Amino acid sequence: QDNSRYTHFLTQHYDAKPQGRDDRYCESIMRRRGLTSPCKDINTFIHGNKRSIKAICENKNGNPHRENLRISKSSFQVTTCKLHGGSPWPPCQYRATAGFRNVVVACENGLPVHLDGSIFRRP
Numbered sequence: 001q002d003n004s005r006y007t008h009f010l011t012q013h014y015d016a017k018p019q020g021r022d023d024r025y026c027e028s029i030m031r032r033r034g035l036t037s038p039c040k041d042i043n044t045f046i047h048g049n050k051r052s053i054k055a056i057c058e059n060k061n062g063n064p065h066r067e068n069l070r071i072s073k074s075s076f077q078v079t080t081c082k083l084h085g086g087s088p089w090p091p092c093q094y095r096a097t098a099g100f101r102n103v104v105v106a107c108e109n110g111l112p113v114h115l116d117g118s119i120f121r122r123p
Contacts, residue, residue, distance in 0.1 A: 006111035013115045014053065015045045018079065026081035026094035028037055039092030041081050044120045046103060047077040057107035069116055072102040080120045 003055075011033055018025060030036055035043055046053060055061035056072045065071040081094040092120070106114035 002111060003109070005108060005113040009062070009105075009111075009113050009115065010050070012043065013045055014050065015047055015079075016049070018045070018047055021079040021098040023094060023096045025079070026096040027092065030081055030092060030094055036090050036092045038088040039090065040081075041083045042117060042121050044078055044080040044115065044117055046115075047079070052076070053105075053112055054110070056103070056105055057110045057112060058117065062105075062107075069104050069106050071104045075101050075107055076103055078103065084123075 003032060012035065015029060018029070029045065030040065052072075052074060053076075056070050061073050062070040063073065075106065078099050080097045080099065082096050082097070084093040104116040105112040106116070106121055
């Protein structure tokens with residue numbers, strides 16, 4: 001049964017069915033998931049069904065990527081929360097950006113355990 005790292009990945013990166021994906025959504029979910037002490041600089045949540053996300057670890061929905069990651073074949077609805085302001089401590093103000101594209105994860109024992117957030121921080 002699903003080890004702690006996969007469980008942790010879901011806590012930090014999965015929100016099945018969000019409502020509005022605006023700035024207030026970000027500020028609330030970041031607190032709720034305990035990512036505000038200190039405030040995480042940027043964090044992305046994937047939406048949809050868990051099934052498609054786990055499938056990225058297989059050839060059904062993923063391709064090998066770079067040194068040790070996997071990239072999905074299907075696109076996902078996602079929301080990236082970016083810290084606004086110059087302080088790492090609460091209150092954390094976040095700005096939301098909704099998107100729809102494929103994602104990159106690291107798999108361990110057939111389960112997603114890490115999300116590569118670099119493809120979401122548009123410099």
